[PDB]
Structure formats: C-alpha cells, structure tokens
Amino acid sequence: EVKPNPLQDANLCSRVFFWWLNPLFKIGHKRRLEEDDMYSVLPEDRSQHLGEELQGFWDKEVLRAENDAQKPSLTRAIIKCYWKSYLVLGIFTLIEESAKVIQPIFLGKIINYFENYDPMDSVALNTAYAYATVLTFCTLILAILHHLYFYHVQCAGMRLRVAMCHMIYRKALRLSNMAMGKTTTGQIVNLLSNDVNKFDQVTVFLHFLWAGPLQAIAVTALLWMEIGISCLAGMAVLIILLPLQSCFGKLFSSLRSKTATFTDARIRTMNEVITGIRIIKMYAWEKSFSNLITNLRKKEISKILRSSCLRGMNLASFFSASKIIVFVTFTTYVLLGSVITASRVFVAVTLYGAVRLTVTLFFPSAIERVSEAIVSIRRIQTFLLLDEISQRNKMVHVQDFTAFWDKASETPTLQGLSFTVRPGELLAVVGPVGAGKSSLLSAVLGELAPSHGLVSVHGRIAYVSQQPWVFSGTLRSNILFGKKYEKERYEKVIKACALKKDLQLLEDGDLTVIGDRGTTLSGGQKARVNLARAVYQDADIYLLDDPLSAVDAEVSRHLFELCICQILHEKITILVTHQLQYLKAASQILILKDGKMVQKGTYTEFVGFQAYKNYFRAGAHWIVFIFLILLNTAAQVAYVLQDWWLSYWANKQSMLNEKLDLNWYLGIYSGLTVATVLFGIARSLLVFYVLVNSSQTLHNKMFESILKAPVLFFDRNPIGRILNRFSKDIGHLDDLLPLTFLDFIQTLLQVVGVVSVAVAVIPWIAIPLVPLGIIFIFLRRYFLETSRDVKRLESTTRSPVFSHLSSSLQGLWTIRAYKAEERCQELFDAHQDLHSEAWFLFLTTSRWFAVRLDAICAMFVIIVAFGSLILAKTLDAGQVGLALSYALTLMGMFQWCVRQSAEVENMMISVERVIEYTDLEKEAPWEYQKRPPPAWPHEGVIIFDNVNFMYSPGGPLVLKHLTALIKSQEKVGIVGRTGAGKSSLISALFRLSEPEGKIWIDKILTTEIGLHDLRKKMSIIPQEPVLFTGTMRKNLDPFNEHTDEELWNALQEVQLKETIEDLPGKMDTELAESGSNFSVGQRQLVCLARAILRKNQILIIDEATANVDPRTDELIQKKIREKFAHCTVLTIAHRLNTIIDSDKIMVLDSGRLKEYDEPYVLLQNKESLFYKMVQQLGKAEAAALTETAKQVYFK
C-alpha cells in the first residue's frame, strides 16, 4: 500500500473499539491534516474493482432481460451482487433490535426485586446482580458493538456508490453521439453529484423496512404480556403520529416551495444591486431598491415565519409524544381497574421509549429514503440502457457515401462521396465558411456511420476540434496525454509549436501544473495545445478541424507551413479550412455544399462568544431570554415530573394493604401531560420567534450597510462574495439555524433530565460524573479539531470527480478519437479513490468519536443499575424504576445532542459572516443638515481647486492638484489615457471617494451637503448603460413623479416609443432580464431619457458611444446637443471626433491637466499634446476636425 491502512493489521478486537485506526488523531492534534495523511482505501473498495464486480451482475441482468423478453431491472442486479453479502448485517440488525426490546424485561426483573425487597437476603440480590449483569451486556450491544456494525452498513452504501460512479463514467465514454444530443452534462451531474449520493443515505435505513414492524409487534407482545390489551390504547396514538408526522411533511414542503420564489426574487434583485452598485449609487436610487428589498423580505419572511411555527409544532411532537402515549395508556390501565405497579409502568414506559424512535422517526425516514433512492435507481438504469458506441472498430478509402448526420428529415450531410488517400498525402475540405460540414471527420472517425456506403480505415486517427480543450494535469501532462515523455520528440515539437517561447509567458516555468479547470492558458493558446497533442500523438491519420485563424503567425507557419505541410504529410492528413493559401498546396480537396460533395480534386480544381452575544440580542429584547429560559426549563420540569409522578403513585400504592384516591392522583397526573405538551409547544414556538425575528433584524441592518457602503468596497470584494451572503449565509438563518438550534436546546435539557434525575435519586452518583465530564470535554476537544479538518478534505477532493467528468464529457470526441479509454478511466478511478480515502476517513473518524463517546453513555447506565443495588437500603421501589427508565433512554439521545453541538457551532459561523457586514464603513450621510436650496443648480457652475483624488485611500493619486473652472452653460470634453481620464473625474465629482483639494458647485463646496442632496442635482450616462428588471416606468421614474406623457415625451425624444409602445404593459412593461431584448444603444437611449426627465442643469456624459451605430450615435448627439444647450455638459472621449465640437478640452494625462483650452487653439499649437493626440489620427480628417473646431469661433 502506498499509504498503509491499519485495518489490514488491526486485530479482530480492534475494529470493535476503533482502537487502532488511532494515530491519525495524534497527527491531527498537532497539525493540519493533509491529503497524503489519509490512509489508502481497502483494496476491495477500488473504483475499478467495484466497477468490474457490479458490471458483471448488470450484464447478467441484461442477459436475463433478453432471454426473458422483459426490461432489465437494475435493482434486481444490485441485489444479486450484494444480497449474499448484505444479509450478514441483517443478522446483526435482528439481534440489535431484539435487544432493544428485551432490556425492558430484565429492567422489569431488576425493579421486580425492589418490589419484594428483603434486607435479610443475598440470593435475590445475587439474582438481581445476574439480571443487572445481563442488563449491562445488553447495553454493550447497542453502545459499543453497534458502532462497528453501523460502519460496515455505511460501507455498503459507500461501496455501492463508488461502483455506480464507475459504471456511469464507463457508460458515458461508451455513449452514442446521438444520445449526447438527448443528454446534457447537468443530468449526469445531477445524477453523479447528487442523485447517486442518495446511495449512502439509503443503506443506513434499509433494514428498518422490516425491522420496524418486527420491533413494533414485539413491543406489543411484551405490552400485551405486561398490561394486557390496555396497551392497545397507547399503541394507537403511537401509530397516529406516523400519518400526522407525514402530514407536516407536505405542509412545510409546500411552504418551502412557497418561499423559494421570493428568495430568488430577492436574490435576483440583490444581484442587480451588487452588479449595478456603481450606477445605482450615482443615480441616488438606493431608496427605490431599499423599498423593494424590504417589502420582498416582508413578503418572504411572513411565509418562513408561519412555516417555522408549523414546523415548531412538529418538534414539540417529538418531545411530548412519549408523555402523551404514556399518559393515555396508564389512564386506561387504572380505569379498567388495575393498580399501578412500579415494574409494570417502568417496563411499559421503557418499551414506548424503544418503539417510539423506530416507528416515529426511523421507519418514516426509511420509506422516504428508499422512495428517493428508487426513482434515482430507475433513471440510472435508464441511463445505463441508453445506446452505446459500436466498439467493433496507413490508408483510408471511402466510396458512394451518402449518410446523414442522423437518419432524419435533415438534408443529407454527405452525398456522392468517394475518395482514396495513401501514405504521403494531405487531403483538404472546402465548404461554407464556419459550417458544420467538418462533421465529415466524425464519419471518418466513425462517430458517424454510413447509412449506405463503403468505408475503410487503418491506423490511428488524431482529431482536433475547433473547440479547445485540456485534460487534467500539467500542460506537459496534457501534451503527454498518456504517452511516454519522449524528450527528443517533445523538444522537437514544442519547438515546432514555438510553444516553449510562449510557455515561459503562460505557465511561467516549464514544469508547472495547469490550474483549476484549465484556468492558466488562454483559449487561443489552449487551441494550440490540442494541435500540440496531435503532433505529439505522431498519428497515422490526421483529421484537422478548421483552426483558429487568429493564431495565424510565424507560430502557425512552424505548425502549418513546415510541420503539417511537410512532416505530418507522413501517412495521411486531412485539413478542413478556408486557409486556401495553405490549401493551395493541398494534394486533394473534397468540396461540400448543401450536403453534396459538389466536386473533388486538388485545389487547382477551384467560534467566539461575541457571535452568540450579537446574534441573540439582535433578536427580541434581552430580558425575553430570561422568560424563554423559564419555558425551556419548565417544560423539562414538566416532562420529568410526570414520570416522577408516575413513580410516586406506585409508591403510595405500595403502602396500601381500600382504594387510592383515583380522581386526585389521576387528576394531577393528567395535569402534567397538559402541562408538558403545552410548555413543549410553547417553548418550540418561542425559540423560532426569537431567532427568526433575529434573522429579520440582521438582514435589515446588514442590508443597510451595503447601500451605505462606499464604492471602493465593491472594487475589492468580488461580486459573488457578497451575493453569496445574501443568498446562503442569511440562507442558514432562515431555513435551518433556528430549527437546528431548537433541536439542540430540546435535547440538551433532555440529557440534563436523565442526569439530574439520576443524581437526585442516587445522590452519590454525582462523584464519578465529573471524571465523565472532563473526559467528555477533552474528547470533544481532541475530536473536533481533527474532524473539522477531515470535513474540508472530503469537501475538496469531491469536486475533481465531476470536474473531471465535466471536462471529459466535453472531451468526448478527442478522448474517443485517441481511444484513451483506459487513461481516462485510470484518472476517473484515481479521483474516486482519493475521494474514497476521504470518505473512508469521514465514516470511520466520525464513528471513532461515537464509540469512544457512547462508551461513557454505557458507563452511565451501568453505574445507575449497580449503584441502585449497592444502595438498596436507601432506594424507594418506584424511584429505581424512574432513574433506570431514564438512563436506558440516554443510549439514544446522547450521541444526537453532540452531533448537533458541532453542527450548530459550525453553522453559527454564518452569524459571524453576517455580523461582519453590519458595521462596514459608510459614506458620509445621504443627506446633511446643511441643505442645498431648490434654486441651487440654476447657476451650473463647477469649481476645481487643488483637486487631488485617488481611487482608494492612500492609493495612487490620479487627480493631482487639479484646479479649474467650468462655467455656466459651457460644453467641454475631457480626454486622455482611460484610467487617468475617466473614472478619476467621474468619482471625484460625484464624491464616490472624498476628493482632496476642493470642488465647489454654484459656489457651494461639494463636501458641505448630503450625498443625495448632491447626486440628485446631476445626471450621468455611463459608458455601459444598465436597465433594471421591472417596468419601463421604474427604469424611468421609480418615484412615479413623472407622468406617462412626460415619459412618452422622453420615449418620443428618443425613437424608442415606436419600439416599446407595442409592449403589453406600456410604461408598465415588465422588462426581460436586464432588458436584453433591447439593443445596447437602446439602453443608451434610456439613460438619455433619465436625463431628459431629471432635467439637471449639470450633466456628466461618459464615453457611451464607443460602440454604437453611427446614425444611432449621431441621433444621440442630436438630442444631446439640442436639449442640453443650456446645460453644462462634460463628455469623455473614446475618440476625439466625438468631442471636437466641445468649446474646450481638459487633457488629464498622467493625472495632470496637460491642456485646458479651445481645441482649435490646441491644434493651432502644433506642439500641443492634443495636436499629438490628433497626430495619432494619421489622416487628413484632422483638417475636417480643424475646420469643425474653427467653425465654433466664426462668431
């Protein structure tokens, strides 16, 4: 073994305690674990081996299906492969569950001793120790050995999953090209990423499909043997919870779908804000989106709030049920005339505790998980029944060939085809430009096949698609493509590709690994790599698809005019291209049009405590937690006092030699049931209300921060990084954290229930509990540091599996052309192994903790039992039965509590990642107390003085000392290097970061007012316009202040009305996604409407028309020039002609005012930088500009 596996040498005891799969924790306590540390798989779990195993039975099922003339069944195939193995775990399942029923009987007899307690005996005490001894062994079944068994069940699922991953990838490479049309990777990805992941989740439960009924029956048997048919009153309620719990499933599932539409609506809108934040902020449209997001959140939260409450009732059912079904039983047992006797009640109580899980939870889940599995199995079977490529398989000859792309109504892609080519030759193909006719190679490749026609091929085929592609590994590993590194040929061809000269620039060093998904290489350079493979593959047949002509350079001359044009003329090659300057040298050409071979011939034919403190206080007022803690505790007190009351009653019965006062004892007893269910539902609802209300707070406060956040904040943070929070980190605080949190609280008290009962009945048990405490803390400490890191290793190593699948499925035609079946299989098997090593650890490591934990839970029951016998002088008869009835329950819940502790402590990180945003830096307020007058912009005056600006605090200065006046009604253009010229001036004038120096507007110092007070009074048209998914009205006036005739006027100021007035909503036309239905220029026309409505006296225009239809551009100019003659207008130039009409130009190059003058005077100075920038025109058009400038000064 490359990585020796301790199961190979752990003794037969070792796997009971996981004693020896141990050193990995030694390492994990000191170090971050790493991908070599994880042990290799057991040899029998390897992806190839499980593949070959299961493929055999599936083939035999295909044989059965043919011979029996029926559909094959994949479930039958997997069964006959696994069943003779899988049965053995059944026997444990039987013996395990039988003991869960029998502990009650010996528990009875232990209690039975206390009913006939005599001090002057040792034999019954010895008899009791015997029962107490067997009660211990029963616990070691469930508490220790169970953790061996449960692992191997996990492995049957893990084994089954890996086999299916193998057979799937095998089937995919064999998949017909036609089926690929009927398929998409996303199906195979849903299949292999998720739908096959169902196969772990099934095997844990599969035996409950039958073990449940047996268990339930047996409980009814012992119950019939115990309390007679009075138990039928109780069991009926236990059954009713199965349909009822099923009922909740539909309702909350509905409400889940009821909410899904709004999280998308919020998150899709949220996406526009983070995408548009630059343009949003400059328009001062924060308020519009603020209203929307709030009200969608109000619409959304109302559903999730009601849903949580109709889930909160569900949790209290899992808490209080046992107190209901106990209550209806013994009430019946009294009224039908029995006394209550401690043994019989605590026997009955414990049996209900045992059956409850099997019927209330496990069997319900069991039928569910198989139901999800079986549908997945059917579609995988269907996928395994898709058609396959026919694996039947120096020169190529074709004659009379007439096949379609597919036998169909398509016009046949090839007709009249015959040709012959012999070693030493290049064929070519010519047809429509960029046309799919190169699919001819797929017929030569055998990817297509003759409907009728003769085809002959001998020797290997290289293929390159016009699509670039990369396998996994290094570029060299991609180039090697499973062939040996032939240094001499590698050097010769990498030189022939000129590729080493470029590889220093692309991989930055020869032996460098291709980054994720091929990220390192330019696609055009990656296009070279496929050809680099082909030339590296030294092939006998070269089938070349139409190359990326942008590569046409001396690199391509080395590739084409030497390597292809002379060397790879060895044996055969075919090059479909319109590179007729290379194909004029072609030996023969096949010419295709409308599917005809119209002619053929040679070319001459042509987490810290601060998290919890902030998270809870953001809920309801902090005093409410004190009231909440009374509900949490009071419920627990009602739950425990019920069974204590049930015990106390039996004791009073034992004094009787006459009746107990039924209607006092039973009256009170029923009181506690009413008490315990009521507080139970009361608790459950309250906790959700506090936390889901907390989600409401943290959302609003946090969302406020995004809008007040300065634009610099988005220049650092990637778009995804923020939107993920609104999508999924707040996602946790709605769907899942409150529920997971309540369950934890609901259990933690239950563990305190058992413990406090035990120590209150048997006071001296408090002593060993402290050792038990500190061990637990250290173990949780030692484990969780290790386990958290294993979780990361699993989460990482999974993604290559479908990533390899995805690129491989993209790579199909290449991979199959080279017949690289085993190399790709070896690779997919490899990843599945590395993932299997992580999944192997996750299973065993999670388990190790569980057994080294439930050992103490077993230690706990044992101390209660023997402690009870030790103290027998002191113990009251019923009170033994109480403490034992509780203790035997702990063997369940103790593991589940600590599972949830890690899950909440992990998920509480989503609270921290949201608090992070709630106090980011803010711009200066949107409004100041100092306020601009309504008449303010009526001067239209801009002052620049000493203006120094940086795109970030302390960053490079890109405005330097800039001091200038822009006067009323002036029209001035600004130009230079893009990063010196545009975003610098945009941001500083709009206070997107506070400029140094000073800017004044109409003798108002621009720092002195609120930012909406500023930004409302100016308009921007950016280079990239944006339209927001919503009405044309909202894209024009989200404040509804401008009437549709005004809006239509704008729509009639532009030409757009005659292109939108047809739309069904008119002004209320709900746009397509970002209005992609509208032309880019049309989006630009919309911004002008925003200006036309805004009517600002000051207008800043970015270089919008950099890529606009000239007549559309000149239309833009007309309305700009017309309507804003009185306005003061800044324009940034993509090209000088766009601004040559300006009264003046400011030249901002290197961040300095290189020029500020009349452009003609600038051109009158043959030394001016503007003249030099005009000299870059290289054309007499400078004169047309020159006159056009001069025309301004005619009068």
Ligand SMILES: CCCCC[C@H](O)/C=C\[C@H]1[C@H](O)CC(=O)[C@@H]1C/C=C\CCCC(=O)O
């Ligand atoms: C009252 C507390 C129980 C609430 C329901 C509980 O989650 C359901 C089943 C629990 C039960 O408490 C005993 C037990 O071990 C079950 C664990 C659940 C799944 C198996 C994996 C356990 C693992 O490896 O973590």
